[PDB]
Amino acid sequence: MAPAQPLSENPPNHILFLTNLPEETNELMLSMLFNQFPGFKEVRLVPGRHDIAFVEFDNEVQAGAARDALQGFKITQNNAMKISFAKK
């Protein structure tokens, strides 16, 4: 219940890897959505999958900007997309 401990240290992180974002979605799509951000560094969305997104954004302000921009991509209409920072 909200402990006063130094829990987590990397956050906010600038690498968001996860899936749950398919539906003819693609690499130039996610590359332009990720492109929106000057942080546009790594974009991995392309196998038969078209549903596993690996986004490396120069910095977390821009990774956080992209993530906060599409922070609830209702694929949930079947599934709410899942993007998980490279928390380590």
Domain count, the chain: 1
Which residue shows structure tokens 């996610």?
A: 30
**Other C-beta atoms lying within 10 Å of the C-beta of residue 56:** 17
End-to-end distance of the chain based on CA atoms, in angstroms?
Answer: 22
DSSP single-letter state for residue 11: P
Are the C-beta atoms of residues 43 and 31 closer than 8 Å to each other? yes
CATH number of the domain enclosing 6 = 3.30.70.330
Residue-range definition of the domain harbouring residue 75? 1-88
Helix (H) or strand (E) segment spanning residue 63: helix 60-69
- What determination technique applies here? NMR
Residue matched to tokens 């599934």 = 79
Q: Which residues partner with 15 through β-bridges?
A: 56
